[PDB]
A = this chain, B = another copy of it.
């Protein structure tokens, strides 16, 4: 039977994977090889000019990595997947495959910082200009389009304060103007959002976060039409970034994603409990979490995502000093820059990852002095709340 016919949890577990044909090994073998041998010169000829359209494997189409690419293609309802060395490489491989000197991109502003740096500094040095807009306002996207515009690029929910972007509406705008829509689905993952089903042409993830979920792989994935993915593979990866994923990283991500459904359900149930606790706490001025009724785009999130995700941002009373105290007083949450792990991770951007960026530039970038971002893990939510309550109380008494 066909992977695409099963329910979503069944696809999470099975899609792209079968017992090994030669051995019956249930786990996908780790094909940790750099080379593939041919049985004759004919085979060498055919299936190295053919470009992987029988079943012939190559280091750009490793059997292990193939399984992961097919899985994620199924979960996202795209035709084909392409794994990469990092979430950044998924984004740059995509964009550098699509764009040449003289092209233009319209991008959301409220995006992952390293993406913002690639788009603001790197792209224009290759002759590709980018306009940044507030993608929460689809009209700003339309107004930025140019005859040169090849692609519109968005993240949702948006990186710091988890404001949302209306994918369906933006896809319509981009397509009417003949651009592709590229959506970074990292923070939702397949489970919570499916951009392609909403009109996006290409979805990218950092698997580093939820898809792997175990805090032990850096990796990225791109999903879209075969025609695009073929180019992203045989030109973008092969020729431009060289950002191939190692078969071991693919194997671990395959293993991590087996639990995607139940981890996302746990992260989301936990985050909701925690968000409600924070919403009720007199030392917290604001809580940003799509799952709360006070979310300005609550209606959109309802239409567009199946769960409200495991990330919460919130502002502590007392600004910068309160933020540093709270962060230094947590005992269970771990201070880190990543997200989407099994452990609960916390960060204070204005206290840590943005100390150089003067008061003007960080607040502008959505980062207030009292802003804390919380990646909710799989611990007992009452342990996480107790830890937060203890740290907040210390920071604000």
Which residues of A are interface residues toward B (Cβ below 8 A)?
1, 6-10, 12-14, 19-27, 29-45, 48-49, 56-57, 59, 63, 84-93, 100-101, 114, 117-118, 121-122, 125-128, 208, 212, 214-218, 220, 235, 238-246, 248-249, 251-252, 255, 258-259, 261-263, 265-266, 323-324, 327-328, 331-332, 334-338, 341-343, 345, 347-348, 351-353, 355-356, 377-380, 382-383
Contact = CB atoms under 8 A, between A and B. Distances in A.
A335 B45 CA distance: 11
Given A41-B327, A342-B258, A10 B336 contact: no
A100 B126 contact: yes
Contacts of A45: 351-352, 355
Contacts of A38: 24, 335-336, 352
Contacts of A121: 239
Contact of A246 (B27, B246, B347): B246
A253 B114 CA distance: 28
A29 to B, nearest CB: 4
Nearest to A128: B126
A337 B92 contact: no
Contact of A6 (B26, B356, B380): B380
Contacts of A327: 40-41, 44
What 6 A-B pairs come out closest when comparing CB atoms? Answer: A89-B242, A44-B352, A7-B380, A88-B242, A35-B338, A126-B126
Query: Which has the most chain B C-beta neighbours within 10 Å: A89, A216, A218?
Result: A216
A380 to B, nearest CB: 3
A334 B22 contact: no
A76 to B, nearest CB: 18
Contacts of A244: 85-86, 89, 218
A216 B32 contact: yes
A21 B20 CA distance: 11
Given A14-B379, A44-B351, A239 B122 contact: yes
B20 A31 contact: yes
Given A31-B29, A259-B342, A41 B85 contact: no
Contact of A57 (B8, B23, B249): B23
A315 B100 CA distance: 41
Contacts of A37: 19, 24-26, 334-336, 345
Given A41-B327, A380-B7, A215 B259 contact: no
Contacts of A63: 22-23, 25
A335 B1 contact: no
